[PDB]
Amino acid sequence: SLIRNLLDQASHSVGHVLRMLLGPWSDLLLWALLLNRAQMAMYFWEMGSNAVSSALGACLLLRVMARLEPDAEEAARRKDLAFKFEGMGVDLFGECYRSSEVRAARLLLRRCPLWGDATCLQLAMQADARAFFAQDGVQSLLTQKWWGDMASTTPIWALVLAFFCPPLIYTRLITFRRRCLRRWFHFWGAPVTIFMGNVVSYLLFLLLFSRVLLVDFQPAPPGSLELLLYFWAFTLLCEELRQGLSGSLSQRLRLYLADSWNQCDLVALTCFLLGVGCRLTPGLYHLGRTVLCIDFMVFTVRLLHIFTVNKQLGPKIVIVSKMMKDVFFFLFFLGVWLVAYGVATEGLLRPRDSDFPSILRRVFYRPYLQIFGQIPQEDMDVALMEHSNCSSEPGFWAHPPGAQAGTCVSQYANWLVVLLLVIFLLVANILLVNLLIAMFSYTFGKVQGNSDLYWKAQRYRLIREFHSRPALAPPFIVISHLRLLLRQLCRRPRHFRVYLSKEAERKLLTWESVHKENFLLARARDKRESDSERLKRTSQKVDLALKQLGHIREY
Amino acid sequence: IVIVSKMMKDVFFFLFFLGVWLVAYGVATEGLLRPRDSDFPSILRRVFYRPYLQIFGQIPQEDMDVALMEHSNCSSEPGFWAHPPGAQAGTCVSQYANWLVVLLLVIFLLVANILLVNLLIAMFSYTFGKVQGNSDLYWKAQRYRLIREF
Amino acid sequence: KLLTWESVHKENFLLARARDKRESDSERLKRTSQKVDLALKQLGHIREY
């Protein structure tokens, strides 16, 4: 199995868990989980302490072991145990939140001594406990943390007005949980305010980049505006580099190459560096301008991910991410039909200007544009063209008026050319677009129910990442960077983690144990009231009656 | 009627996505081709209005493709320009990267006119199917209030 | 060896499906009905007492 060999390898030497494990109920529970004893795990859980934290840790280790399983059956057993176990854990935490909201809220951030001193939230995220993030209790607590010391009942427009007018903080609007200085730091350190500052800074960055690209990008040496834009770009590069380094050196970069949004930011920044180099070098000014235009497109795309936090939009964004397979199949089919129809028409009518770019244009671009209402009838039908004799080759040609429709086409089979145009319009503009409608509707209907749950996890990760992000905006985050490097240089000569009281820890443990035993007795009553169990009981009672009646049959 | 009132969230998300993609594509084309008439209203028109109208069958090929335009030498700046015939398409654009301009036009048409409209179809159908069953009940209450008010 | 393995797994599958059928509520209600009927019959066999 994966227990004896794992212990032998650890002795011969998740890795921290293996190191700490070697050959009060925590040890029994962990042994039950590693031995794949489902009933032992359940019972040790239910009669042991720290049920929620133990549940998150144990389901994390179940997922890890199922991934490590070389046997599909054992992996399936471990993973189904993990699903049932995370579900029952989240049910317990839901019934806990149903009792005392603030008690459960401070139960979350409780740094439990076991499982590597990691909070429940980090354990769930490492375990991919989407269901354990789904419940309204943890959702509301995450919302309040995103509104850290801001009384989340405040509306968004109040927040934007307060951001625009710093004096507005000391008003009746926007309540909150050196008083002026403390309020100032709370306002400017709240993760939601950090997010708003980042959004406004990014909008200003895009506006300035567009202004530079459309007006101030002459081949003259860079001006003050160009230098300032370069300064913002370098600051963003430093920001992303530090974020990747913080969130072991090579292991961290291998971790960072994931999270495709960071990949998009990285490729955008590399394109920016290439564009700056080409702009600075004399010869490649035009190439620099083109690549910077492409980079603007990439940055505008990244703005979407920056604006995925909205409660009504994130599921839709992950939906449109999921719809790529359907659009991609449609791309194949459209390409095939476009090749067929374009080559057919390019063979039926033979323009004199047979240059390769012109042939490729007439075979791909124009048929593609026929889909969206651009139909050059005067270019590809003879009855709309004036007849003339071009070449010595025997035929009737009727030179067109179009600039890139050819010098003059042939006309032997224009009836079948028009027939092909009709067929192509019927297939591409009717069969394909409406069939893509069908696939899009079906995919949305199937996927939305899991997309919203994935958005819950994504929003938790978003809250964590903006909490980890420093205070000042990217245009001024150079101050934060120099502050952190000074802190790095200060030690050379030398995550919410809300504190809980020591007696409060014991009171939370007792409260959680009491509510756990209440939930178990409730579920036991439910199982007893279940019709199948009742029929079981009736069957046994009837059997006992029959047996004891047989014991008096001799009378 | 109460359904179409409820559909505003979907149309509103679509408005966000269309605005983002329009900004991206418009600025890309406005940077790739550089009309001489760089007045602010003209720049804003070319970056927002014309790309928006490209969705509904208004494609100024003769305005933004060089192979359809007559070539001429406008300015001392080194390049080939090929002055357009359009009235508000610019005095004369540059032509260094019109292949990629046409590629961007193709990509924008594929995304906005195919991905977005059909995806909005999907959301509209799903929202209608989900909401009609309560919308009719709300209409019952609304009609009672209507009777009372008249 | 494949024949023996297949036969063993086949009889395992049949016994599993038999247990499933027995645990089925309809079959259980059948069994309860027959047990109640037998109890009634043998109680009638001692009615004369």
Ligand SMILES: CC(C)CCC[C@@H](C)[C@H]1CC[C@H]2[C@@H]3CC=C4C[C@@H](O)CC[C@]4(C)[C@H]3CC[C@]12C
């Ligand atoms: C926030 C982003 C996405 C908006 C994109 C719109 C862009 C194209 C707009 C917004 C601000 C605009 C600039 C604002 C002011 C001027 C000064 C004027 O004398 C020349 C044009 C110029 C430089 C504008 C060009 C177009 C512009 C850059």
Ligand SMILES: CC(C)CCC[C@@H](C)[C@H]1CC[C@H]2[C@@H]3CC=C4C[C@@H](O)CC[C@]4(C)[C@H]3CC[C@]12C
């Ligand atoms: C739906 C899909 C299959 C449609 C594909 C259309 C693409 C491939 C078409 C549309 C416009 C076309 C371009 C139009 C003009 C030029 C400039 C020329 O100097 C090189 C070829 C090039 C760059 C063409 C290559 C093919 C092209 C990019």
Ligand SMILES: CC(C)CCC[C@@H](C)[C@H]1CC[C@H]2[C@@H]3CC=C4C[C@@H](O)CC[C@]4(C)[C@H]3CC[C@]12C
């Ligand atoms: C809705 C669908 C069915 C419409 C299809 C349009 C068809 C019927 C049209 C398109 C072009 C037309 C053809 C154009 C030219 C010719 C050549 C002539 O010597 C005989 C008539 C003939 C052959 C026409 C008959 C009708 C025609 C084939």
Ligand SMILES: O=C(COc1cccc(I)c1)Nc1cc(Cl)ccc1C(=O)O
């Ligand atoms: O959805 C996302 C979110 O970032 C995006 C990055 C680029 C473009 C878009 I629109 C969104 N990225 C993913 C995209 C794919 Cl095609 C597959 C998986 C993921 C992922 O989230 O891992």
